[PDB]
């Protein structure tokens, strides 16, 4: 069933041609990790404060994602789904985080996996402070579990050093690219911490979620989080439609949820989440 359902989504996805003009511009070639994995123009994050006479200066490979199945009077978080930093786009990443008021970053990849580069680091070591373009970032501490690391960051504009934002950086360590975690417990614990942190803030901006390509593990974890928010707010009676949720998310960024195993993992994770919610209440 799982293979057939995911195959069906893949077949629809070839017919998913929203324009991706900005990402395809020659001037932006070095800002994309994979030349076929690009943000839709209609939902791309546009970097502010840049010189429009520098071609492509506003560009980053990332999109706003929200649950567009919800009615306008309903309320659930907005996400940004981003690729992982290249050396040339680390400063772009920090401009995005700053301008969007993001207070939580969710990294679902390791920097290097099996000798293959996935994401360049964009934080300093513990206790250290480093400038990234116009922003200063200080690593104010690291706290680890078996499956993920939390780094507590402080970020300030160089031109405005008394304005300081705390940003919480959550990195999941055991979700391989094009693959799935061995069990869903780790991700569910991960997401619980992430949501607790986000909601404990007044008016934080969108949570930034990224992987390497910004579609597989990023798409899968966003869909899981969306379904958890639905269950949390509407109860266990809620109608859950994973296929419909994935196609809705794919209207906002191409190829979200990359493999049939990741598709199955959404079911596995949500089913475990449901049994947890059933017990507690």
UniProtKB/Swiss-Prot annotation:
Residues with the modification Phosphothreonine, per the entry, are 152
- Say which domain of life the source belongs to: Eukaryota
Described function? Tyrosine phosphatase enzyme that plays important roles in controlling immune signaling pathways and fundamental physiological processes such as hematopoiesis. Dephosphorylates and negatively regulate several receptor tyrosine kinases (RTKs) such as EGFR, PDGFR and FGFR, thereby modulating their signaling activities.
| Name of the featured protein | Tyrosine-protein phosphatase non-receptor type 6
Q: What tissues harbor this protein?
A: Isoform 1 is expressed in hematopoietic cells. Isoform 2 is expressed in non-hematopoietic cells.
- Tell me the residue numbers annotated for binding substrate: 177, 211-217, 258
Please state which protein family the record places this protein in: Belongs to the protein-tyrosine phosphatase family. Non-receptor class 2 subfamily.
Give the species this sequence originates from. Answer: Homo sapiens
What are the Phosphotyrosine sites (modified residues) in this protein?
135
The lineage, from the top, is: Eukaryota, Metazoa, Chordata, Craniata, Vertebrata
Q: What is known of its domains?
A: The N-terminal SH2 domain functions as an auto-inhibitory domain, blocking the catalytic domain in the ligand-free close conformation.
> Where is this chain's protein located in or outside the cell?
Cytoplasm; Nucleus
Indicate the residues that form the catalytic site.
Answer: 211
Q: How does it assemble?
A: Monomer. Interacts with MTUS1. Interacts with MILR1 (tyrosine-phosphorylated). Interacts with KIT. Interacts with SIRPA/PTPNS1. Interacts with LILRB1 and LILRB2. Interacts with LILRB4. Interacts with FCRL2 and FCRL4. Interacts with FCRL3 and FCRL6 (tyrosine phosphorylated form). Interacts with CD84. Interacts with CD300LF. Interacts with CDK2. Interacts with KIR2DL1; the interaction is enhanced by ARRB2. Interacts (via SH2 1 domain) with ROS1; the interaction is direct and promotes ROS1 dephosphorylation. Interacts with EGFR; inhibits EGFR-dependent activation of MAPK/ERK.
**What post-translational modification does the entry describe?**
Phosphorylated on tyrosine residues. Binding of KITLG/SCF to KIT increases tyrosine phosphorylation. Phosphorylation at Thr-152 by TAOK3 leads to polyubiquitination and subsequent proteasomal degradation.
Q: Which residue ranges does the record assign to the Tyrosine-protein phosphatase domain? A: 2-273
Q: Where is this cross-link: Glycyl lysine isopeptide (Lys-Gly) (interchain with G-Cter in ubiquitin)?
A: 66
